[PDB]
Design a protein around this nucleic acid. Structure first.
Lengths: 445, 297, 445, 299
DNA sequence: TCTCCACAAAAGG
DNA sequence: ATGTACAGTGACAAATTATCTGTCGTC
DNA sequence: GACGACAGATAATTTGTCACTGTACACTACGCCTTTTGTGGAGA
DNA sequence: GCATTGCTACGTCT
DNA sequence: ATGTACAGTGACTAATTATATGTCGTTG
DNA sequence: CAACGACATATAATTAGTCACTGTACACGTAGAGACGTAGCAATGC
């Protein structure tokens, strides 16, 4: 409901200079005398300066600068041609079809010879007409999200509810990425780019734990990352750590995308055994807390390394293959040292006064009791349902073995939890009430 | 003459040493005042750390012209009922001339001791710095509306200075709407608008009604440093800026917020960031360089 | 050798006016008057005007404006820190590694800590020091090539010799691209993006022939494109051609890259039979006559098609798989009409006054007589060398064979040529006195 | 007073209609002539289609100041002995710049165009369309040197204009080296130097020494429209341009080329391009639009 | 006619 | 001496409205 | 010294021209991997 | 044995 | 109300030199 | 009554740091597909 004049246009600046003599209160005679005297200041008539003072009275400082012509931003090619150009660009750019202004001009010429119009809009005119559309598309593609501020935080879910994050282990985020560093075996030969599965607290933004390996994102890989993030951290002298990764504990929630490794039955049993509920995210940007740090690892650690592939194939160096020198072990030592000594000790962006580890430790509702390795290993074990034949001898994945207290239930279907790295020994359970109890183990014989 | 005929604006440095709300020792403030010359009544004040320039004079004039409203925190007894626009204005580039032309009065480019005696001398830190900008401003406003404006001048003394001002007005002045004074406010340029109609100012988020459609665009901010809870958003058209809306701060723990307080909060955050040691950072960097140099072949 | 002052400021303009007022010849008594008038109008001392006229006469209008200080572009941090920053940036960006100026500032801080220096250069200073290097690198990667001008033209070979292009059908360039348009089969189902093998005459830049198909680039696909280019082009009414593809004949040179289909012994056979001398290109930029048409095809025809995948992963629309609706036959129709009606009829940009086809036809040394399409097919046949036994018992490709004249000729290695599309019937040749002759179409059993 | 004194510059619309090499008509040329005061000698000339402006008077002044070397194609049996710098340059924002740079005084205040028209221009076929600018300027140089400088003006003594000018020299003026007059030449502001140190100017490729190291940069161009076979490269600093090198045109069918001839060649090529039909392309694009319109999605 | 145990297909990243 | 060209652009002349700017007239 | 009619007069836009230049063409993602969910052969 | 004819894999190029 | 957050930048200030600039004294 | 060097005071032009703001990559992702020549080997008829 107001207009303020800026960039006063030195012509309009001296126009303001003259308009400040007419402002002083005066009688008719000297007002007219200075009107005429100021007419020669800018070499105009007296009706012109009359109109000047009238416009300055009506519009203020914006009446001193000449207004833009009402035809600015419009086109004289006609409404029909303008609509034709805009609609042709809109339809030719529908879907995967990409249509440049030159193609629009060609179609304009085609329609003109169809309609026998001897003056089709020029290609330059087409570019000028379509410039606002391209500009607004560029503005739309460069939209910045404000992000969360302060300590209050919630994560949207596919179920539609908002998962509040309020404690230091309330919600854990886990996601996968392919590291932009080509690694090398013990001899000097390229193996592959490893997979980075990271576990990060949502409330503290501290890295709960990581999984770096050559295996693709699977239920077992997520289980390894969860095991690292849950168990207390112990690193030897090879990692020249100055600080400690004093991080451990169970989560109460698990926030991941819709990957098959995260929607697996194995993850459901893992959550039901460790007392956390797995949740979905509607959009990848909802898991930004776990998803931004990858970039931080690229911009601070991976870009500095002899083998490096960039963000995509457009920026991938041609030197990446022959510059590859780092093993998985060396890369993982560098990564762990970066996380412990830089990333976790770095300041949480929203807070500005706390490190990520300080926020994590301070925000713990209670000091969690460390979970023994055996219980957690049993918890993250792949399981199914199987029965036992006569005389025991339960067979599992084209292998057979028998233990004790097994033949007596021949004909009862029981749970079967195992580690898919040492299949020789498995755990046979039994649902013996509405409760399920550890029957025995099936060991290879 | 008469009331609201000629106004004079002068600057001084308050001898009181001020500190922020967190205790950090700041500099001494600059006090700017506008005086109704015919009545010698205080018109408007601008108490801040900015050196006397065109913007400070504009802010003081904006305070003087507009009707005055103060909260209960000022503990005011009388009400500051002085307003209206002057026919002349005296002060120490071309900004003031533009403001005067826009608001319809002539601006000419050329009472501190009575405040420094009975107010500034009494206050702590005069010439132990314990007063903040808000506290000093509260004391100054209470003194001006309760003592200086309610005082009686040495000459022709028969009524209060406020009463002399009120009786000397030929006609009650029609109030100028606040928006028309936006020319006198502090200005920030090239401020991007984010999704949902938000922009960042002084490390704070400002949600604005009727701003969602300008996301991804650039707007200009006008604000009052005394109260930056609500700022004003403008669109630049290469020759003029047009009002859009008033953007409101979010996440504030207090209903009042000034520019000095936000700057102090940002300063505290910056210092707390600087106390975070980075020896581990440099050590990791140098050993990473050593490790990559080891593999070199 | 010469210095000219331009873009002088308004203050420089008033100084120029005062120097013009000071240039008219006069006498000491009246010269001094305007000298001090210049001093007054410049609100400076007379000796300042003395220095002004001295530098104006000793330097020209360059001395009129104040010279930039010697520290412009210099850095006050010190030569040591200058060299350290530059060396750190250069070393860290050597190879696949990429060190940003922020990491250079971090290393500067670490070194200053090691040197016990309390005043290291700031990160902004590091950015300022490294800005010239970055601008020079960008300018190096943004250098434009003038290209050939006029009618004369030569192509550089990997052998190091320059091969002259003098007339039509003298040098033919053939190359493969992966079309950016997804295709569907009958009833609607995507298959792949077709391969496009283009053969174009170098002297005229006219497209001699094309081969569009899902089969990968191979000696067979190059042979198909070669047959299309050599043979006269006849197209049915389904191709709604307005003009005629009247390009045909056999070239004398074949300028291709180092692709395996082009260095194959099959292509050497084609060259020996038809009369080619196949050549290689040292760099891809040396085969620009055959690469730029790919860009033109993508820009003008392929980008407007429904199922379109831009030549990138970054520019690929998300609707390409769902927008994919065209077939190989319809794509071939559109491509052939684009080449015949638009491309060959377009201006050869090097000359600017004649079409590519008109240049090709006018550049023909002698009008050629076309192959009757049976000798050409025999020419583009895969060759081998087999041994005939037991009066004829050829076993080529694990198939039985027996000719009619192959009984007696059963003790000599016989040249064998065939077309992989049909192994049922083959051709057998002798080798007598450095010659050959056809024996019989050895059939299969 | 003496010979090298007030120089007068006047503008005339030459009434000889001209055509390019290929026959396309061109507007009547302009003439800008510098003339001495002590003598009635033509100091220097500039004939071109460009209207009066700072650049044309600057070029004429540069011609007047410099020594004149003319090829044998001019058939000049008399040499032009003009050189030197005047005390004043009465002519008519920019001219004062060269005035201060060279030393003379420029002023924005008996034109000899009438005798030029009545003795030479009326003879020309296109007098007010078979003469190019080069032939016109050859004939003009012929008239100025052999028939004008050698015109003994009896009203000004028994000596001719050239020898009157020569006798009026207090001393032989040392000629200004040509480089110090690049301010008087025409300018092209931004020009990208390409690989190998080449420039693309007036649809021609220009190559010069010391330019290979400036590939990717932007340089200024100073050129004389009479002869664009050689152009001057200048590199732009904050407030000045420094001479860099001379760039020579490549692929020239003739040893001499003017700006008018390059423009005519570009015009001929553009006309040849525009004369090519476009109906087939428009039919093709319309039919491709129709074909993609009929085809169905995967619904 | 159930239990192991392969396949293939769809659907996410 | 020389990669290849086409979309896109900068600088500018040409065409076209549209406000502007002087005169009369009535205030 | 206020305004409106009213008619040229600038001049501020759009429109079209054309010489110059940036940059993609250089084989390249739909494939890999995983995990659940049928469906069907060997056996009990 | 000893020479053809098939494979498979590996380097290399696009 | 809210995705994340770090590298680079813009605008400003403070420190740091490099000349600009008003006398004094010699020079014709 | 104006040129030519010191000179020492004074701007002021240049750089070095500050610090709030903003753009933009993080979102599984090119080493693989396919072809062709050059070795090794095996089936195999004499």
């Amino acid at each position: 409901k107001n207009v303020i004049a800026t960039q006063l246009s030195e012509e309009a600046q001296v126009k303001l200079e003259v308009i400040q003599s007419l402002l002083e209160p005066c009688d008719r005679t000297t007002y007219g005398q200075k009107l005429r005297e100021a007419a020669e200041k800018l070499n105009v008539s007296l009706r012109t300066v009359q109109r000047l003072v009238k416009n300055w009275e009506q519009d203020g400082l914006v009446g001193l600068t000449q207004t833009s012509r009402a035809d600015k931003g419009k086109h004289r090619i006609g409404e029909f041609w303008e609509n034709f150009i805009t609609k042709t660009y809109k339809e030719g750019n529908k879907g995967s079809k990409r249509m440049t202004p030159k193609q629009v001009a060609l179609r304009v010429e085609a329609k003109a010879r169809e309609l026998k119009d001897s003056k089709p809009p020029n290609y330059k005119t087409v570019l000028r007409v379509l410039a606002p559309i391209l500009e607004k598309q560029q503005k739309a593609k460069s939209i910045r999200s404000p992000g969360w501020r302060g300590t209050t935080l919630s994560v949207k879910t596919r179920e539609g509810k908002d998962l509040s994050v309020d404690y230091s282990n309330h919600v854990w985020q886990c996601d996968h990425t392919r590291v932009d560093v080509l690694l090398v075996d013990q001899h000097g030969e390229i193996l592959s780019r490893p997979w980075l599965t990271t576990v990060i607290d949502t409330y503290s933004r501290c890295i709960m734990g990581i999984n770096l390996g050559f295996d693709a994102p699977s239920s077992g890989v997520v289980a390894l990352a969860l095991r690292h993030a849950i168990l207390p951290k112990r690193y030897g002298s090879e990692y020249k750590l100055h600080c400690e990764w004093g991080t451990y504990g169970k989560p109460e929630h698990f926030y991941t995308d819709g990957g098959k490794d995260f929607r697996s039955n194995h993850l459901s049993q893992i959550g039901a055994q460790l007392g956390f509920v797995c949740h979905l995210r509607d959009r990848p940007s909802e898991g930004g807390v776990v998803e931004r740090p990858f970039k931080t690892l690229n911009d601070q650690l991976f870009s500095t390394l002899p083998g490096y592939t960039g963000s995509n194939v457009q920026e991938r160096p041609e030197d990446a293959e022959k510059d590859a020198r780092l093993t998985l072990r060396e890369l993982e030592q560098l990564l762990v040292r970066y996380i412990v000594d830089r990333y976790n000790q770095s300041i949480d962006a929203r807070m500005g006064d706390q490190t990520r580890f300080e926020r994590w430790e301070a925000g713990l509702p209670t000091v969690p009791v460390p979970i023994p390795e055996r219980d957690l290993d049993i918890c993250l074990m792949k399981q199914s349902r199987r029965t036992v034949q006569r005389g025991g001898c339960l067979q599992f994945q084209n292998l057979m073995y028998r233990g004790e207290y097994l033949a007596g239930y021949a004909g009862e279907t029981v749970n079967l939890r195992f580690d898919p790295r040492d299949i020789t020994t498995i755990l046979v359970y039994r649902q013996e009430n509405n409760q399920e109890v550890f029957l025995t183990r099936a060991h290879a014989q | 003459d008469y009331s609201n005929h000629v106004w004079q604006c002068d600057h001084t440095r308050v001898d009181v040493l001020l500190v922020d709300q967190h205790g950090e020792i700041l500099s001494r403030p600059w006090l700017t005042t506008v005086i109704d010359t015919y009545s010698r009544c205080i018109m408007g004040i601008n108490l801040g750390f900015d050196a006397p320039s065109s913007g400070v004079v504009a802010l003081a004039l904006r305070h003087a012209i507009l009707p005055k409203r103060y909260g209960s925190e000022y503990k005011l007894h009388c009400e500051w009922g002085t307003y209206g626009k002057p026919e002349h204005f005296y002060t120490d580039s071309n900004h003031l001339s533009q403001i005067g032309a826009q608001l319809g009065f002539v601006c000419h480019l050329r009472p501190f001791k009575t405040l420094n005696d009975q107010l500034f001398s009494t206050l702590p830190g005069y010439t132990d710095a314990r007063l903040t900008l808000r506290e000093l401003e509260q004391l100054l406003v209470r003194y001006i509306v309760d003592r200086y404006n309610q005082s009686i001048d040495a000459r022709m003394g028969d009524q209060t200075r406020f009463e002399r001002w009120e009786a000397g007005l030929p006609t009650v002045p029609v109030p100028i709407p606040e928006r028309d004074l936006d020319i006198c406010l502090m200005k920030q340029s090239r401020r991007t608008v984010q999704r949902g109609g938000c922009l960042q100012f002084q490390n704070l988020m400002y949600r604005g009604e009727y701003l969602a459609g300008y996301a991804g665009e650039t707007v200009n901010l006008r604000f009052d440093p005394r109260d930056i809870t609500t700022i004003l958003v403008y669109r630049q058209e290469n020759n003029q800026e047009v009002f859009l809306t008033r953007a409101h701060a979010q996440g504030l723990e207090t209903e009042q917020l000034a520019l000095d307080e936000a700057e102090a909060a940002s300063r505290r955050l910056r210092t707390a960031g600087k106390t975070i040691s980075n020896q581990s950072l440099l050590q990791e960097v140098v050993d990473r360089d050593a490790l990559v140099a080891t593999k070199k072949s």
